[PDB]
Each structure stands twice: as C-alpha cells, then as structure tokens.
Amino acid sequence: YRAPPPPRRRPGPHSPDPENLLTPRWQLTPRYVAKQFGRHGAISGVPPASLWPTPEQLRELEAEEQEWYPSLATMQESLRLQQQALE
Amino acid sequence: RARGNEYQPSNIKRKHKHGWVRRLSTPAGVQVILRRMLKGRKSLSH
Amino acid sequence: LTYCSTRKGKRKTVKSVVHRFLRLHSGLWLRRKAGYKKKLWKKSTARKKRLREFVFCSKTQSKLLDKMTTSFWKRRNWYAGDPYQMYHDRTNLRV
Amino acid sequence: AWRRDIFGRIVWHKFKQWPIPWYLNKRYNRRRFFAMPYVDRFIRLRIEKHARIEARKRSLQKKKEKILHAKF
Amino acid sequence: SPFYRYGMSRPGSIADKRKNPPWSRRRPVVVEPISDEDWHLFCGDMVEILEGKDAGKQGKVVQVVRQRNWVVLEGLNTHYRYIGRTKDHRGTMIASEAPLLHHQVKLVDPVDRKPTEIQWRFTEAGERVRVSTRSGRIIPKPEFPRADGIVPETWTDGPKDTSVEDALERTYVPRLKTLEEDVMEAMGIQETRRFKKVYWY
Amino acid sequence: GADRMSKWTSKRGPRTFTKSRGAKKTGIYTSDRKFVQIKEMVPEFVVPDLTGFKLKPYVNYRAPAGIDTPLTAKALFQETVAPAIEKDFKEGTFDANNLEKYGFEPTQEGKLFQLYPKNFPR
Amino acid sequence: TVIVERWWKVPLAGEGRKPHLHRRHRVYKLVEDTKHRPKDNLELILTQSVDEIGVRGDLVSVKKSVGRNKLLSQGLAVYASPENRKLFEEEKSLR
Amino acid sequence: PLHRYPVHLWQKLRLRQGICARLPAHFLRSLEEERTPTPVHYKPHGTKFKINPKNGQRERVEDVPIPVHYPPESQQGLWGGEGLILGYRYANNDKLSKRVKKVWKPQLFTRELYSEILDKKFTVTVTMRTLDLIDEAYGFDFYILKTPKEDLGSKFGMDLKRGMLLRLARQDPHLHPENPERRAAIYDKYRSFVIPEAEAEWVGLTLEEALEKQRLLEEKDPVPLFKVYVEELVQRLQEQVL
RNA sequence: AACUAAUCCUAGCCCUAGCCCUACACAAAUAUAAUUAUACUAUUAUAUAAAUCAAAACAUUUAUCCUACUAAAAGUAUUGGAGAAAGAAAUUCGUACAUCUAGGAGCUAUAGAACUAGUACCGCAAGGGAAAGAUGAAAGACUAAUUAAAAGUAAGAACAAGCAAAG
Ligand SMILES: [Mg+2]
Ligand SMILES: [Mg+2]
Ligand SMILES: [Mg+2]
Ligand SMILES: [Mg+2]
Ligand SMILES: [Mg+2]
Ligand SMILES: [Mg+2]
Ligand SMILES: [Mg+2]
Ligand SMILES: [Mg+2]
Ligand SMILES: [Mg+2]
Ligand SMILES: [Mg+2]
Ligand SMILES: [Mg+2]
C-alpha cells in the first residue's frame, strides 16, 4: 500500500461565511479579522486603516484613560498633599 | 360483604367518564391523549 | 469538601482555612491563638503574651490543611518586601 | 385544506357539504383546527422519536452491507 | 413478511403455506443482490453446469426463483423421491431437480455449444439484447410456454369472450364531456332542475 | 371489564344508543315523528340497453394489449380544442373573449354535472 | 412604579453572554416606590385665558393632575414643547 | 443522535423557510432583532466600573434585568413598560428570616386619551408612568409614535402606531374632512415619522397576523389549463406566421 | 442401550461520526357516547416549579436539575447560618477532515431497545406491561443432527449402628 497524503493545516487567510448560522460567532468578530492580517499580512485583504481605532472608538479610549489613569503631575501633587497631611 | 364486584358496567357512564369527547374537553385530558399517542397505544380512549 | 466540581471537575479549597492559616512554602502552617481577643481584662499578662503569638501547626493539622486547600496556595510567591521571606525555608534540618 | 389539528400535526382536511355557511354552523365551529402551546413539547418528542427510527434503519443497512461483502 | 423464505414450491400454494407459517422465524438466507439489468438467465435458455454432480452437462432452464438467485434445469442436478405416497402404496419413484445458483451455470452460445459469458448491449432498433463477450453474437430471448397453461395460438374463444375485432374497434370520440353527460344525452334523459347552493367546509 | 378494542356499533350499548351502518339517508324525519322519503334523494340506477352489444366480460388471449399512455390534459386538448383554434387562427377569426366557442366553461355553476366541486357520484 | 434589588449577587457573564439566574436570584428587596416621591410640576403654554392662572400665552407651572385633567383635556393649554414655545413667543412679540 | 442545530436557533431557521421567507424583509428585521427594553423596575448601573468597597479594587459591573410578568390584560392597555414582579422577599428584610412569595402589582387607572392623527378618544387602562412618559413626549401621538415596540409593550399600543403611521403615510383626507387646513397642520406637525406605505402596513403585526396577511396577498384560484394551453398554442401559431 | 432436557446464530439493538427539515403517502368515515353524509349547542395553555436531598438535626442556604463557544486565567477574585457549599469576569487561544454516508480491544435471545409489542394480559381510569425463535443447497429431498453430559427420574426399593464421611 501507499499511505494517504500527510495531513496538513489549511493555508492562507480564512474568512468564514457570515450568513451561515452554524459558523461560530467568535470567528466573525473584528478581533478575528485583525488576526488574519497579523498571520498573513497583505494577502489577508484587510484594509490596514481598519486595524487602528475608529474616531468614535478613539474617543472612548481617551475618555477611559482620563478617568482611571491620571497624569504624572496629578499623581505627584496628590502624594505631596498626603505627606503634608501626615506631617 | 363480599368485595371484588365494584365494576357495575354501564356504557353511558363509561363513554361519559372516559370517552373521546370527555378527554378532549379539558387541556389536561388532551395531554392524556398526547401521551398515549406518543407511547403508541392502540386504544387512545374508551 | 468538593473533590470533583460540577463545572470544572476539580478540587475546591475550603475558604475558611484560607481565612485563618498561613502556609510557609517549607510545609509549615501558621495560626493565631483562640481567644487572643476575648476578655483580656481578666487574663494575666503572661497569658496575654502567649495569646498574641503566631504559632505553628502539628503534622496531622498540617496534613488536614493540605487536603483542604488546592495547589495554588502551596506555590512560591515572590513578594517584594515580604516579612516572611526568611521563613519559607528550613535550615540545618536533619531528620 | 391543510390544517393543524389539536394534537399539533398537519393533516389534509376534506370539506363536507352543508346547507349553511361555516360561521353560522354551531356543530362545525366546536371543531378546533389549532394547537395550544402545551403541544410543542410533544411536537419535539415526535421529531426525536422519528429521528431515532431513521438512525437505526440507516445503521442496520450499513451493517447488512458488511455481511454481504464479507460473505461475497 | 421479513421471515418468509422463498422455496421451490410456488408462493401461495398449499406446500408453501405449510413451509412458511406466520410463526416461522427461520434464519435469513443471504443472497448476492443482482439488478434486473444484471440478470441474464431466462426460462428456456440452454445453460451448462460448471460444477457439481452434473458438471459439464448442458440443460434447459424451466424455473427461475429470482429471490434466491436460483435457476432450475430440467432433468439435471437430480435426486430421487417417491411421489403420491399413501398409507396403502409407496408411490412412484421420480427424479427431482434441485436449484442451481446463478454462478454455478453459464449460458451457451447457440451456433457453437460452449459456455460463453455474455454482456448486455443495445441494437440498431434500440432493443436490449444479450451479446456474447467472445465471438460477439445475438443470443435471442427464448420462447417459453405461458405459466397459466394458455397457448394463445391454439386458443379458441367460447361465449363471454370478446372477439379480436370487437376488442380493437375504436369508438372513442374525444370531447369535453364527462361519461355522465354522454350517457344522459345518449339515453335521452331530460333534467332541468339544478342543485341549490351548498357550502363546502 | 369493558372491551376497548372492538368497534362501537349500534348492537352495543343501551336501546337509546343508535347509529347508522353507513347507508345514505333517503328522507327526512319531520315533526310528529314521521319519516318522509324524498324521491330525489333515492339513487336511481341508469342502466343501458345491452341488446346488440358486442363486448363481453373477457377478451381473446390473442388480442394485443396497447402501449400504456394515460390520458393527460395536453392529450385531451390537442384532440379536441387544437384543430378548431388552429383552423380559426389561419382564417383569423379568433379572439380571447370567445374561448367558450371552442368548449371552455367559464364557471361550473348552473351545470347539472359540476367538475369542481363534484356534485355527482361515480 | 416599584423598583427592586436582588439580595444575592449575580456573577458576571461577559460581553456577549447573558447571566444564568438561579432560584435565589428571585429574592428581592424594595429600593424605592415611585408613588411616594415628591411630585414635580408640569409646564404648559396657555391657549386661552383661564381664571387664576393667566392670559393666553402665559407660561405656568401647575400640578400634574390639574394640567392633564382640565387644561390639556379641555384644550385650555398646550404642551410647552420647544416648537410650541417658539410659536407663542413670536405672537407675544408682535402683540 | 443529535439535532443538527442548537435549539435556540430553531426559531431563526423557521423564519428562513416556507411562507415565512416570503414575508417582507423589513418585517423580518423586526422579528429577528432582540432589543432589551428600557429599565423600569431596577436601577441601571451608571458606570461600567465601580470600586469594590471591601478590597478597594476596580470591578466590572453589569445590568441584569429583573424578570417581569406581563398579563394578557396588559395588551389591551398602554402600561408604560410596567408589569407584575413575581418574586420572593425575606421577612423583616433579613437574610436569616423566612423566604416568602411576594408579588408587586402596578397601580392601574382608566383614563381618556385623545389622538390628533386619529381624532378619536380612547378609554385605556394606564399607569402613572405612562402619563409621565406622554408628558415627556409632548402628546399622546408622539408617545405612541416615538416609543419602540419593546418599551411600548402593548399589542394595542402597536396597533395604534400602525393606524397613525398609515394615516400619515397616505395623507388620508379622512382626517378632519371639510377643514383641509387643520388636516395639513396635524400632518405637518408629525411629518418626521412618515415612512413608505408598504412598510407602515406591517408595523406591529404578530407573526401569525403576518402569515395570514401574506396568505391573503398570494391567494389565487388555479388557472384553468384550457387557458394556459391556448396561450401556448396561440404564441406558437403566431410565431410560425411571422 | 433414555426420558425430561441440552447444544446453535442472526433477528435486531448500543454508542459515535455525518446531516436541518420540507413524507404532508387511494375512495369514504371521524371531535356527535370520535371514526355516524347536513343546520339544533359555540370555540381558547400557564402568574415564580416544588419537594426529596446536603448541612450528619433544622429554620438562610444546598452544584446539575434551571444550557448560550472550547483551553487558560482559576477553583483565583468574590459569594456563604463566612457553615455545608457556591463561584466569575477582564484578558489570551482555537480555520476542523471539509469529500464522497464512516467507524467499533460495543451486545448476540435472562445480553443488546420494553419490543416478535406498547401487543397479549392487568387496571374504572391515568397507567403498568410480558414471554418467545433455531433442518438442508434442495422439503417439488416425508423435518436435520448433535450430547457418559444439569437438577429430576428410570434402568435397579430396602436389610442392626447413627452430619453419612475418613482411616
Ligand atoms: Mg377488583
Ligand atoms: Mg349501583
Ligand atoms: Mg471570557
Ligand atoms: Mg439535613
Ligand atoms: Mg429527625
Ligand atoms: Mg426531616
Ligand atoms: Mg427547607
Ligand atoms: Mg430481550
Ligand atoms: Mg424484555
Ligand atoms: Mg442426570
Ligand atoms: Mg456405621
């Protein structure tokens, strides 16, 4: 006998069918799309501008940053006041 | 007295108490019929 | 306790143990003395000092506490400025 | 017409001749051509019951082919 | 019925009813499936026995039980039995044939008497005909007497049997009228009343 | 103790219980407990005259059976309607409105024998 | 309306999932019943002159029951929407 | 054996086959989409993060809507998303007391409401929340027109919306006849909500109503094959003459 | 020198894989006391699952039951008569054999489906629910053989004395 051809992983970018109900949800997110570009680069067909945050998304990131991540000067000033209160 | 003769047959009573029209009158009775259909009973009701 | 959990199929820690005892990596367990915060106005000074101390657990108690906790609580933790840094190891122990 | 009976099945209904229209016939109107929600659980059970029968029949054919090829 | 076993006795006969009662649950016989196209053996075909007690002896088919892939040859593969036995008398000794499976015989070339394997192929007219694999030739379908015993040529019809001409006479005249309308007009019935409106539901 | 598998018929049950055996009604029960048979409701057998008829129950075994060709709407249409329309089309005297001229029936109402819904028995 | 809060914490479900609830998540406590709140006033622009409220076109704040029961239903007043505000404002300026 | 599809996808599959598939695309969008109604019986979390007071750490928080029971009577009224809360309580409000069945019932009122687009006064069972929402919407017509299906939560409410939308879509002169100027003013005031006549027809219909509507649209008596064959014959004969 | 019996192998079943479905298969009859060719007399699911049980009692509470992608984060954070127990997410990973209808260190008649059958039979009813079969290529060859072989008997009752045997 001759053995069957060796099993191989499917090559190239893979875009699942959106309409098909069976197709798993996780494969249709933008997160999945970006992963195709990372592995296969240009041949993925992803428009690179999509990889970066969109202007509405950019505002959300900046809004989140201000609330929870203060600037160095504010951090220093608050620490200074606490020492004075302790002193 | 001697027991064991509690069945006193009467066709009018039998069909009124356990018949087709009686079973379909209430949803609980209809579900009785559905159960017997799913089992494959030859006799769904009296 | 739970040996095989429904969701993950794993052993489960008894959290009442984690809330009362400290495990040193060498295998020892630390605990407080029962009653060290109770009715101090009628206890002798030497008695109060004995109560305040941190105390070790016996071999059987250590074996039980090992069964009631999972491996995550037995690992090495490299805490900066750890006050128990020196007590996670045994020195000159021949036995 | 194609109608759903009270048991949740689809059956062809043969019409009968009457001298009055359907909305004025009290005997006819008492007949129900709809199924209430308590029937859906039974509808699924029939589908699953039938699916088991089909699965066994297909398996048995495959088993029977084994005997033929082994024998011949 | 799944447990029915096809035998030499014709189905539905007294012998078959005795053999195949409703309660019989005998082990199924395994038969190699053969398509209607695949089968090439027919009653009246001369065939040769490849192997067995009568290997190499040519015979004529007289019965075919397709459900068992059987072909029965007249006067061959024959054992002995007593027919018509009764309490008083033994009966008459006869030689009884046994069924032969399809692969145990081969069809015979007509001009040269040899066991030629054959292949199915169409003809100019389009009629399907068996052709020999080697020495390509047309092996015609043989003619066998009708099972019921009716010989059409010798048949002479008695009363209650339509004559040929009468059966083949054409009287139909296509028209958009039902049998009911045709008969009433032919029979001269007159009806001017009409059914009142009926509601179907 | 009752028999559930046997059929429910009028022989069983009390005298008050009655039901038919499938015979079609031939009349009406009026008030005063009177049966009134209707002549029209009683089926009448239309029997032809069999004198001189050449067809008998059986056929000659020598009579060839024909190739089976079940009748279809197209086959009926070609035999009956096509020649008339074809002839009229050549003469040019054809219009959509007068399909009734060739045998079309716009409606079944008013016919003694209606094709749908059928109003006559076999 | 009635506003209720669960006694028992519900574990988080994640972005694309719905939490699976249990019998204990059906036990509630009453945070508030809106019936007992202090009641706001409702603002209308009059379409006529009605006693003790003002002349046609005035802007008033009235009890909600009074506004709905009489002013709105009887046609005396109209809702003080921005579109209504603009129209009546123009009329007064011309007047 | 196993079903090919998970049970939760069964409804979607049916909408994709049969007479359901022939329904208009816009109508199916309303059926397919699942949108959560505005919170009524619980306070939503203002932020997506809060500080857990015990350990002082930022923790993600989610809104879990309270299950609310909507009686069939509510479909004959315009409750402002309110419903029956079927739940449990702890006697004396302590976790260590008995668990008691508790039902919180909305306070219902009967009120008269006037629709300008329909020029009709309806008697409706209503809650104080609905009256407040109508005030926020600047009129009964605006409340019905603006509010979505989920928040409206009434088959009667959806039925009213279809009437208003169809009235606007057709610019029907049946509104205030003999006063064309008043009719125009009302239509102009609500001009923002105008949509195509075809879409307005299917607004608020249930799936069963839609299937009956579609069945009626496509209902037709079969064509006598006499006509069909004649058309085929005439075309062939006409072509031959050409 | 044998009776009662015993032997047998396939009917089918089990679990996966794959796959949505679209079968809804004469006439007539039937919702009336179903299966009765026509009028009388109108027609319509349910508010939260509970308890057993665990907590060595029980009274808040007790995984699955009461489903929303795998593996990891993690039995961690958190929740809990802070007891018994319960228990995430953020965040990372995953193209699943693809192709056509395949596969078995699965069962072989007390097994494997309850199934030869939801039958017989039992129950007023809801409901419960069995048992079994075996010739050969041919029976259009008289229905096959094979086996000191189970218990039980027979062929062949017994003969002072005893856990019935052992020396
Ligand atoms: Mg008894
Ligand atoms: Mg009595
Ligand atoms: Mg996650
Ligand atoms: Mg207990
Ligand atoms: Mg006790
Ligand atoms: Mg107890
Ligand atoms: Mg309890
Ligand atoms: Mg068995
Ligand atoms: Mg059994
Ligand atoms: Mg013996
Ligand atoms: Mg002795």
CA–CA dist E20, H26 (Å, integer): 66
Protein chain E, residues 87-126, with a C-beta closer than 7 Å to any atom of nucleic acid strand I: 96-99
Q: H238: Cβ–Cβ under 8 A, 6 or more apart, which residues?
A: F89
CA–CA dist A69, A81 (Å, integer): 19
CB H1 within 8 A of CB D55: yes
Burial class (CB in 10 A: 0-12, 13-18, 19+), E194: exposed
Burial class (CB in 10 A: 0-12, 13-18, 19+), E68: middle
CA–CA dist F110, F100 (Å, integer): 15
G42 to chain H: closest CA residue:
H135
CA of C3 to the centre of ligand 8 (A): 39
- Provide the terminal-to-terminal Cα distance of chain G, rounded to the nearest Å: 45
CB-CB neighbours of H166 under 10 Å: 16
Task: Tell me the backbone φ, ψ of residue H130, rounded to 5 degrees.
Answer: -65, -40
Smallest CA–CA separation between F6 and chain H, in Å? 38
CA–CA dist E130, H182 (Å, integer): 94
Q: Which residue has the tokens 């008013």?
A: F110
CA–CA dist H63, H48 (Å, integer): 9
CA–CA dist G29, G10 (Å, integer): 15
CB G9 within 8 A of CB H71: no
Length of chain C, please?
A: 95
Report CA(H3)–C1'(I73) in Å, whole number: 33
Nearest to H106 by CA among H123, H90, H129: H129
Residue D38 approaches strand I within 7 Å at CB: yes
Tokens in use for H181? Answer: 């100027």
Smallest CA–CA separation between F4 and chain E, in Å? 26
Neighbouring chains to B with at least 3 Cβ pairs closer than 8 Å: D, F
Tell me the C-alpha to C-alpha distance, in Å, between residue H111 and each of E178, H78, H108, H130.
67, 10, 10, 11
CB D6 within 8 A of CB D32: yes
- Chain E residues lying within 8 Å of D68, measured CB to CB: 30, 32-33
Give the three-class secondary structure for F76.
helix
Tokens in use for D33? Answer: 């051509």
Strand partners, G27: H88
Tell me the C-alpha to C-alpha distance, in Å, between residue A80 and each of A66, E61, H169.
21, 117, 67
Nearest to H80 by CA among H108, H51, H46: H108
Burial class (CB in 10 A: 0-12, 13-18, 19+), H205: buried
Tokens in use for H58? Answer: 């930022």
Quote the DSSP letter at residue A9.
P
CB A21 within 8 A of CB H5: yes
CA torsion, ordered A41, A42, A47, A51, to nearest 10 deg:
20
Smallest CA–CA separation between H1 and chain D, in Å? 7
Sheet of G77-79, strands arranged across: G59-62, G42-46, G77-79
Tokens in use for E167? Answer: 């059966």
Helix (H) or strand (E) holding E191: none
CA–CA dist E201, D18 (Å, integer): 7
Q: Amino acid identity of H168?
A: L
Q: Does A69 touch chain H (CB under 8 A)?
A: no
Q: H92: Cβ–Cβ under 8 A, 6 or more apart, which residues?
A: none
CB pairs under 8 A between A and H: 7
Which bases on strand I have an atom closer than 7 Å to a protein beta carbon? 9-22, 24, 28-50, 59-70, 72, 74-91, 93-97, 102-104, 106, 109, 113-114, 116-120, 123-129, 133-143
Question: How large is the angle between the packed helices F82-91 and F73-80, nearest 10 degrees?
Answer: 50
Protein chain C, residues 25-64, with a C-beta closer than 7 Å to any atom of nucleic acid strand I: none
Quote the DSSP letter at residue G68.
I
Q: Does D36 touch chain B (CB under 8 A)?
A: yes
Please list the alpha-helical segments (H only) found in chain B.
Answer: 11-18, 20-24, 27-39
Length of chain E, please?
A: 201
CA–CA dist F83, H238 (Å, integer): 15
CA–CA dist G79, G72 (Å, integer): 8
Strands H49-52 and G77-79: unpaired
Tell me the C-alpha to C-alpha distance, in Å, between residue C21 and each of C13, C35, C73, C76.
13, 15, 11, 16
Question: What residues have their beta carbon closer than 5 A to ion ligand 1?
Answer: B 4
Nearest to G40 by CA among G58, G67, G59: G67
For chains B and D, having 3+ Cβ pairs within 8 Å is answered yes
Tell me the C-alpha to C-alpha distance, in Å, between residue E50 and each of E26, E95, E110, F31.
30, 21, 17, 88
Rounded (5°) CA angle E31-E34-E36: 140
Question: G65's torsion region: left (phi>0), alpha (psi -120 to 50) or beta?
Answer: alpha
Q: Which nucleotide is nearest to F19 (CA to C1')?
A: I36
Task: Tell me the backbone φ, ψ of residue E85, rounded to 5 degrees.
Answer: -65, 135
CB E116 within 8 A of CB E106: yes
Give the three-class secondary structure for E143.
coil
Task: Tell me the backbone φ, ψ of residue H109, rounded to 5 degrees.
Answer: -135, 155
CA–CA dist H216, F95 (Å, integer): 32
Tokens in use for E91? Answer: 């009966």
Q: Which nucleotide is nearest to H52 (CA to C1')?
A: I78
Tokens in use for B20? Answer: 């087709």
CA of H97 to the centre of ligand 6 (A): 20
Resolution given for this structure, in angstroms: 2.8
Q: Amino acid identity of B45?
A: S
Q: C74: Cβ–Cβ under 8 A, 6 or more apart, which residues?
A: C23, C25, C66
CA–CA dist H139, H192 (Å, integer): 15
CB-CB neighbours of H117 under 10 Å: 24
Number of helices (H) and strands (E), helices first, in chain E? 3, 11
CA–CA dist F80, E172 (Å, integer): 12
Q: Amino acid identity of D69?
A: H
Per DSSP, the residues of H44-101 read PPSSSEEEETTTTEEEE----PPP-B--GGGGGS--SS--BEEEEEEGGG-TTS-EEE
Cis bond leading into F117, ω under 30°? yes
Nearest to H127 by CA among H83, H75, H73: H83
Counting ligands in written order, which one lies closest to the CA of residue H99? 7
CA–CA dist E195, D64 (Å, integer): 61
